Amino acid sequence: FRIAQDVVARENDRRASALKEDYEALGANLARRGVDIEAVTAKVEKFFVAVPSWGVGTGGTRFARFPGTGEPRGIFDKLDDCAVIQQLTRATPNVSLHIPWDKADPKELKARGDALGLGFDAMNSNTFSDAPGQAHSYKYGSLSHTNAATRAQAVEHNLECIEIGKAIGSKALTVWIGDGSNFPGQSNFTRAFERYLSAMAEIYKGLPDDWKLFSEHKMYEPAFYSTVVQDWGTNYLIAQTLGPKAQCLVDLGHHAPNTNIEMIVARLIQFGKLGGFHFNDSKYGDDDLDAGAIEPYRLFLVFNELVDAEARGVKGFHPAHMIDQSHNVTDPIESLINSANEIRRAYAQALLVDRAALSGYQEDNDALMATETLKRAYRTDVEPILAEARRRTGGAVDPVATYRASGYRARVAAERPASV
Amino acid sequence: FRIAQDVVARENDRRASALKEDYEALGANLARRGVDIEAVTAKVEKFFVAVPSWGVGTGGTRFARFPGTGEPRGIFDKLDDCAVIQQLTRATPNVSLHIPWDKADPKELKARGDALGLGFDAMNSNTFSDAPGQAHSYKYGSLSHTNAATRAQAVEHNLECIEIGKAIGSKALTVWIGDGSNFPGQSNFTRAFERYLSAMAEIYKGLPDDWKLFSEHKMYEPAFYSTVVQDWGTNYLIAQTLGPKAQCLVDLGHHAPNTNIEMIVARLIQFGKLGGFHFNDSKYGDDDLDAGAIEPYRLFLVFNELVDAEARGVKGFHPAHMIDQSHNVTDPIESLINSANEIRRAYAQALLVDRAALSGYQEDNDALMATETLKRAYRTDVEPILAEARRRTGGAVDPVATYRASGYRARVAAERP
Amino acid sequence: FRIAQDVVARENDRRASALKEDYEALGANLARRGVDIEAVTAKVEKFFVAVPSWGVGTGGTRFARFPGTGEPRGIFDKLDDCAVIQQLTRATPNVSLHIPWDKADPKELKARGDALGLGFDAMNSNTFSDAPGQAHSYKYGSLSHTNAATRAQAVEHNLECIEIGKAIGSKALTVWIGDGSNFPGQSNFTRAFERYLSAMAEIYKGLPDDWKLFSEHKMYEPAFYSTVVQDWGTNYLIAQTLGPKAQCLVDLGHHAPNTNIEMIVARLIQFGKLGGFHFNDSKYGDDDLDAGAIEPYRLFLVFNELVDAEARGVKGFHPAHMIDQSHNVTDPIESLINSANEIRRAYAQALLVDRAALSGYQEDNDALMATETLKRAYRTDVEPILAEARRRTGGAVDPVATYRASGYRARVAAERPA
Amino acid sequence: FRIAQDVVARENDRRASALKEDYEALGANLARRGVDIEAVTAKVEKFFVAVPSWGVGTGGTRFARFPGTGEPRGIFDKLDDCAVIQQLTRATPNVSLHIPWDKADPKELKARGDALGLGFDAMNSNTFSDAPGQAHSYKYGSLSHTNAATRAQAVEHNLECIEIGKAIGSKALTVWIGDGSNFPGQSNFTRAFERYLSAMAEIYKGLPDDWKLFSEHKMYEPAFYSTVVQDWGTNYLIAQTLGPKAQCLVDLGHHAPNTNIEMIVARLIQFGKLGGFHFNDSKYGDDDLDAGAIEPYRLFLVFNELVDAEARGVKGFHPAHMIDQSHNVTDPIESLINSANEIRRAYAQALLVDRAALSGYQEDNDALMATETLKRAYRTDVEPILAEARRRTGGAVDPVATYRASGYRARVAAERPASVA
Numbered sequence A: 001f002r003i004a005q006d007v008v009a010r011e012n013d014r015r016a017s018a019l020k021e022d023y024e025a026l027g028a029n030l031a032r033r034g035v036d037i038e039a040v041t042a043k044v045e046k047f048f049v050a051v052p053s054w055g056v057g058t059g060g061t062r063f064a065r066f067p068g069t070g071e072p073r074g075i076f077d078k079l080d081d082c083a084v085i086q087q088l089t090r091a092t093p094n095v096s097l098h099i100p101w102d103k104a105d106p107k108e109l110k111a112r113g114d115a116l117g118l119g120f121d122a123m124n125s126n127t128f129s130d131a132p133g134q135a136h137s138y139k140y141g142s143l144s145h146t147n148a149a150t151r152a153q154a155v156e157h158n159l160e161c162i163e164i165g166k167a168i169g170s171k172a173l174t175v176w177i178g179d180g181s182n183f184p185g186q187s188n189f190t191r192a193f194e195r196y197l198s199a200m201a202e203i204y205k206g207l208p209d210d211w212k213l214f215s216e217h218k219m220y221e222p223a224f225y226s227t228v229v230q231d232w233g234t235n236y237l238i239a240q241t242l243g244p245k246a247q248c249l250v251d252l253g254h255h256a257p258n259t260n261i262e263m264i265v266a267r268l269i270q271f272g273k274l275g276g277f278h279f280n281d282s283k284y285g286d287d288d289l290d291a292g293a294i295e296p297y298r299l300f301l302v303f304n305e306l307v308d309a310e311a312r313g314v315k316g317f318h319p320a321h322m323i324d325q326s327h328n329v330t331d332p333i334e335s336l337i338n339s340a341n342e343i344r345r346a347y348a349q350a351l352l353v354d355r356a357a358l359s360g361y362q363e364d365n366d367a368l369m370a371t372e373t374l375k376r377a378y379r380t381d382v383e384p385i386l387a388e389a390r391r392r393t394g395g396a397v398d399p400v401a402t403y404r405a406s407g408y409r410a411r412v413a414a415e416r417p418a419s420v
Numbered sequence B: 001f002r003i004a005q006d007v008v009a010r011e012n013d014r015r016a017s018a019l020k021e022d023y024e025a026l027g028a029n030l031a032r033r034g035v036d037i038e039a040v041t042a043k044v045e046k047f048f049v050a051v052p053s054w055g056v057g058t059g060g061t062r063f064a065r066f067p068g069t070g071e072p073r074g075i076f077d078k079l080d081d082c083a084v085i086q087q088l089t090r091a092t093p094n095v096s097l098h099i100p101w102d103k104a105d106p107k108e109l110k111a112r113g114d115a116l117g118l119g120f121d122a123m124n125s126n127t128f129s130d131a132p133g134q135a136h137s138y139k140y141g142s143l144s145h146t147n148a149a150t151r152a153q154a155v156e157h158n159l160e161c162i163e164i165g166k167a168i169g170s171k172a173l174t175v176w177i178g179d180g181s182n183f184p185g186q187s188n189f190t191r192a193f194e195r196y197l198s199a200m201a202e203i204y205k206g207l208p209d210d211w212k213l214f215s216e217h218k219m220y221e222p223a224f225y226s227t228v229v230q231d232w233g234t235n236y237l238i239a240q241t242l243g244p245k246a247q248c249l250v251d252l253g254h255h256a257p258n259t260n261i262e263m264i265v266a267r268l269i270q271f272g273k274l275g276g277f278h279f280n281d282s283k284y285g286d287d288d289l290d291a292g293a294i295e296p297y298r299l300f301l302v303f304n305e306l307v308d309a310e311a312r313g314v315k316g317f318h319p320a321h322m323i324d325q326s327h328n329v330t331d332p333i334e335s336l337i338n339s340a341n342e343i344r345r346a347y348a349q350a351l352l353v354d355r356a357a358l359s360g361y362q363e364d365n366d367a368l369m370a371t372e373t374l375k376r377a378y379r380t381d382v383e384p385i386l387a388e389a390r391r392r393t394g395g396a397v398d399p400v401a402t403y404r405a406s407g408y409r410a411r412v413a414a415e416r417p
Numbered sequence C: 001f002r003i004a005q006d007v008v009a010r011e012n013d014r015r016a017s018a019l020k021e022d023y024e025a026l027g028a029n030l031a032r033r034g035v036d037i038e039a040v041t042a043k044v045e046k047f048f049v050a051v052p053s054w055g056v057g058t059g060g061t062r063f064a065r066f067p068g069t070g071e072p073r074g075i076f077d078k079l080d081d082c083a084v085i086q087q088l089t090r091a092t093p094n095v096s097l098h099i100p101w102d103k104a105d106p107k108e109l110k111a112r113g114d115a116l117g118l119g120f121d122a123m124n125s126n127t128f129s130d131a132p133g134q135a136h137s138y139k140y141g142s143l144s145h146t147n148a149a150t151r152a153q154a155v156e157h158n159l160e161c162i163e164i165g166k167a168i169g170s171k172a173l174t175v176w177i178g179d180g181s182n183f184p185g186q187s188n189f190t191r192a193f194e195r196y197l198s199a200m201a202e203i204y205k206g207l208p209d210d211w212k213l214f215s216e217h218k219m220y221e222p223a224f225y226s227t228v229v230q231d232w233g234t235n236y237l238i239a240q241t242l243g244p245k246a247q248c249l250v251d252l253g254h255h256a257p258n259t260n261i262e263m264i265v266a267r268l269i270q271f272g273k274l275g276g277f278h279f280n281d282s283k284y285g286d287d288d289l290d291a292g293a294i295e296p297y298r299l300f301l302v303f304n305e306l307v308d309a310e311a312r313g314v315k316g317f318h319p320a321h322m323i324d325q326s327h328n329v330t331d332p333i334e335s336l337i338n339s340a341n342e343i344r345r346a347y348a349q350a351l352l353v354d355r356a357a358l359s360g361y362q363e364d365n366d367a368l369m370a371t372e373t374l375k376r377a378y379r380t381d382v383e384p385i386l387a388e389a390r391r392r393t394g395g396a397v398d399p400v401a402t403y404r405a406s407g408y409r410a411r412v413a414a415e416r417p418a
Numbered sequence D: 001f002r003i004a005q006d007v008v009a010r011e012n013d014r015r016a017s018a019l020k021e022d023y024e025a026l027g028a029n030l031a032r033r034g035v036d037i038e039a040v041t042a043k044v045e046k047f048f049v050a051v052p053s054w055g056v057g058t059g060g061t062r063f064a065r066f067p068g069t070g071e072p073r074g075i076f077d078k079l080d081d082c083a084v085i086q087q088l089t090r091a092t093p094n095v096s097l098h099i100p101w102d103k104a105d106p107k108e109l110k111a112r113g114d115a116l117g118l119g120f121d122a123m124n125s126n127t128f129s130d131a132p133g134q135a136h137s138y139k140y141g142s143l144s145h146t147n148a149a150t151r152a153q154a155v156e157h158n159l160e161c162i163e164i165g166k167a168i169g170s171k172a173l174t175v176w177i178g179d180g181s182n183f184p185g186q187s188n189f190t191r192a193f194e195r196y197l198s199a200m201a202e203i204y205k206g207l208p209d210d211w212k213l214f215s216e217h218k219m220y221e222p223a224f225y226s227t228v229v230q231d232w233g234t235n236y237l238i239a240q241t242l243g244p245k246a247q248c249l250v251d252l253g254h255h256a257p258n259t260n261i262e263m264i265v266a267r268l269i270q271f272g273k274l275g276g277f278h279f280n281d282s283k284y285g286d287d288d289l290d291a292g293a294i295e296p297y298r299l300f301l302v303f304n305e306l307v308d309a310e311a312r313g314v315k316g317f318h319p320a321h322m323i324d325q326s327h328n329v330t331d332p333i334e335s336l337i338n339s340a341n342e343i344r345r346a347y348a349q350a351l352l353v354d355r356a357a358l359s360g361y362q363e364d365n366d367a368l369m370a371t372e373t374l375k376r377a378y379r380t381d382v383e384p385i386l387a388e389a390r391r392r393t394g395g396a397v398d399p400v401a402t403y404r405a406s407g408y409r410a411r412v413a414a415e416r417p418a419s420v421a
């Protein structure tokens, strides 16, 4: 146990009385509304989101990186930190690895995961940066590079990711690349996309029968003029071209200003190409901030579309959700904990929406009551539900407060030497 | 009473039991947080926001307008409908008039106002459209038009708005114009602004000493290349140049994409030039949608700055808040009702912020706990306080439900073409 | 001759000398560049773009409309005005009609266009506004409205547009609706889209073998929260679903801030769904400003994709281009004239691009020389070519000057109601 | 000379003929327009823009940095590369230094500059990153940090930049900081700004009589929720508050999407607070791309405002312009060369605007002709002027071509060790 059980128990006991009061009060309010609080809690305690191994370390910008104390040394230190997030929130049982950053003997990775009670989610390839001893640079691209040798090298790396994933229990490969141009004319849009499609087709060949290949669109950065996989439209063309095993990943902060993101989610679902959603928040661009910290209502609206899919009876809809954030000014462990909480928060709220009433207001074009129907769900403070779900599953009523009480950061700070 | 008191009473009793349960539960939860729910309710029942006379009728776009039934025929019908908003929400006791749309015997206006239990907020001039018999067109601008005669006409119009305002009890004049250009080179940025400043100086000269002159910035529309009063920066220069009685109005949907609007509010407050906030919500441009319907957190963050100004003890801070929305696909009255409700919702939540805790987390640079401190307030469902505040002041526990149960829309539908 | 031939001739001879100088100098410069100026001029004079019948009237905003003098009373006055643009620029041979605004006797329309030297392009349906006596309001939608009867009414209207078009020579129907929602929850995104697809399928069935059905995306307005056909992504799904005769229209001002519009053009072409491009310019949203008045380089880059498509030999690629603008502060005829010119300006510069050189820098990943290769074409002032092309084809060397010299505005102003 | 004179001479001669043809053709067309080409060229050859010392090294993003060959290490390597840009374009005689990156003995800096034919422009402080051994971290801010000792350290560092600048001929300190917040509530907007203003007042006290203090606004990055000096409105408030010696810097890519930047430029000039403009181009955010590579017309429109002010010499108008870009996928030297060219290009075209005619169309509200008046100047291919200006001043007719013909990049690559072969 990364966090002492007695600490968790002690902090839970200290907040038990208030939780009892808030939960029962909420339960009665929900009951008056025709909702069984126990049914919501039961689903909430089963909602999981993958944590990125690269998120437990402090992030930075091109201007600077301000590391905190006890930064994880390698993938093993990262898994140990991810274990804390899962133990306290019980909402992140799976970790998403990034190759070559997390490269290590698959058997050891698996053994560490099992010992910590962590599983492994989608593998993530890396052809947006150069590794040492690399025959060809990705400066001008990878899978869509003009040079065939460079594209084949990118393909082999991705195939390697699949091999590592197969050995640790992963069932998917996420592909996000920086491929694009910074100047008009630098790239022939169409030829670059044709090259990308051919490369991906190669990667697709290496997928096991029960694996998925996820392509992730991004409007810009690292490319500042054009990006090959720039939006969901190109993303759809990709998945539809590759085949049944290919789907699209929607990363919240990867869209143009004012984009109606929840609509994109609904569209991809309608055409069965929503592989998953990558959570984070933003105000300006791909800020990679804590989910829900900037626009909590938008996060709720995305979940409303995810829950409606279930309500409409969409078949075989098992999206792979993951958090993809960069924590530049907070303890990474604490930010991921509260971000996972916000994600469960919005999910619980989407579960509260009176779909019956909603359908009636949509049918009658009663816009005001339709929006108020969503608001009645969203305005509901579901924290007691999230808290109780944690208590029941061995987690903490107040994750961050328990984390701080355990003095975990100080402990790892003393165990881990800062880089020189 | 636009709405029968017996209907109000009925629709309140029907929900009183549930409200009592919710209010008490919240009272206990707030007590555990060291907050007296009674103190919050007392503040909420006193929070008012002006309603735009022109928002009570159905709005439309350049593509089309789809009026509903019982549309107001003029200012008097508009006041009648505004009276419904005030009676049920008790959060909009003052109406903001727009001239010449609402031109009418000032004495008559005041009469109906008093009768309906309404007052008049800031006056709104209109030099972004031409009126009947108007000598010069405002097609190429008004207060900053290249033609002197046009500018003088614009100035005179604003002065007339002041005269009408003084007669009905208004204490401020709001000036928003579309002045700008649609092509590069069309206007000379600096000269157009110089002309605007001089005209506003004339208007300012005709201001009573207990009056204020509000200028309102907008990034674009109707001008699609440049706008004289395009942002708060230009707006500040305007207020600073004109004088102590001149301040800046901040309309939520009037800023560039991703603008940090709450920061703009803070800046203006710090330099004492925040005349008021024009509430509404948006996703794309100046959508003029129901407040909080798109980004309720942003609305709360704006109120966080408003409430912090008080906690910081800022003096003389008494901003003139007003709703400025267009209701294209809903009953204007219901939208205004829920919007005014949302504005009080954000205010109440802001009142819940533990300032001491927040202050400590900011000084120590504990970003996570600092943001969590705001969320603890924001995540609180203050609806019970809003409903109770209304109930205690003669309003409806559920305004829209009561509005619909009264059949008011059907009634005016019969009385109007 | 809507504009006296003596004026045109006079205004041309008055500038003919300077033009020969500029044209001969440019011809020399291009020659030093291995470019035959005559080849460029021959292509330019053949480039056309449809003009919107509703474009010759003064537009406005939700705040106000300031009409000028001599405002057209209807389609016939509009056609008389469109004839002016075509006579002087020789770049707008066809006019795009909008129903019910231009509803009239097909024979009348055709006879007039033939007499004015104008043809008829894509038809435009209108279910984003209510007409007198209309049985069902489009307030909450049309082709995607929740009410079956309302959708049927919208479908019937579109089919009626096809009938009108068949009688006047049109070969395409363009569908742009305001369908969407202003509030979260008001609409169920998927169900609305399904309804839309089903209605469009009914319209598709009524298409002649040689007709095309164009769907046009728009991020927002009149809908301020969500729009059924919000972007090219949804638009592609529509075109692919409907069939071979269904394609996508890209209107420049209809995208999110900072969107790379030229890429959307390349993507739709790659998959054979680029029905056409609707020209205009913008800085904030769907401003509908004169083409190239805000970002002429972007206009150029859009044409770079169009020209590259031809150069690569893309099969069956014949976009249905049209101008879609709102003129709120200028004489509508003059803006359309210069907009059409701005379009040909960008087209001509795109033609000057050394494709082999660009291709080489692209393969070598020489980003600097690649962008410079485009700039060498873009920086070139091709005004002489545009001017010469107009002169040789019966147009005006300086269109707007000739237009103002003819005193046409004052004329129609005296013949039309205030 | 970084580049051999014989190479410059040879490459100029190779293009001399075509240039004469185009220049004469343009001078003729301009003559017919009532414009004397010589009057333009004369001003163009005198238009300079400072080059950032950090601009000659390959840039990167948070995801990666892909260095090219012969990367300059240290300020001396950088000045050597900046010297190339000046020799070939003659538009970048001064270099802007960044402390602590370019920290070195002033006497040696001055000497190396004089030797290369380079002068020194505005000094640039750095409190948006941490230096080794630094007492206080700038993680949560610098000049506006809640910790007093941290602000003091920030202030002392800026004062140190002023001292270095005084020793090498600089007359200004440019201050761009990352100070802001990533989460609502993290910072108290007003208090942070009050702390910032108080700290800047201290720096202001250390300014010589003939020095200027430039503050630079940026909408976001590194801060992703709020930034203390977020826009020109806040920036104006800073300058006005600080005093006559404080002005504002406008960096093209530091504004919200669709912002009308040329208007901001006009407003600052009107109120005498436009300290300078930092050139680069962008499409999505602060992309720091090559000037004019994305929106050349916007660049011209900014210069239309500058040229107008320049003609009618306005009180307080003496801009300290500088290029501030990141070259992630091109030879930094080549990009800076073509960027400086674009800057002069817009300047030249703005110089061709018929102000009398423009003023007329503006007074009559003839929007169509007003915009066309601007376009007639913008559409003019002024390359002949730019190239003739360079040729007359010891530069190269085609700068990049000459740079490539010289083999300079290959030359420095053999002199400077890369990280790997």
Ligand SMILES: [Co+2]
Residues within 6 Å of the ligand: A176, A216, A251, A278, A324
């Ligand atoms: Co992601």
Ligand SMILES: [Co+2]
Residues within 6 Å of the ligand: A251, A253, A254, A286, A288, A324
């Ligand atoms: Co990202």
Ligand SMILES: [Co+2]
Residues within 6 Å of the ligand: B176, B216, B251, B278, B324
């Ligand atoms: Co307003």
Ligand SMILES: [Co+2]
Residues within 6 Å of the ligand: B251, B253, B254, B286, B288, B324
């Ligand atoms: Co507005």
Ligand SMILES: [Co+2]
Residues within 6 Å of the ligand: C251, C253, C254, C286, C288, C324
């Ligand atoms: Co449009």
Ligand SMILES: [Co+2]
Residues within 6 Å of the ligand: C216, C251, C278, C324
């Ligand atoms: Co269009």
Ligand SMILES: [Co+2]
Residues within 6 Å of the ligand: D176, D216, D251, D278, D324
């Ligand atoms: Co800068």
Ligand SMILES: [Co+2]
Residues within 6 Å of the ligand: D251, D253, D254, D286, D288
């Ligand atoms: Co920057």
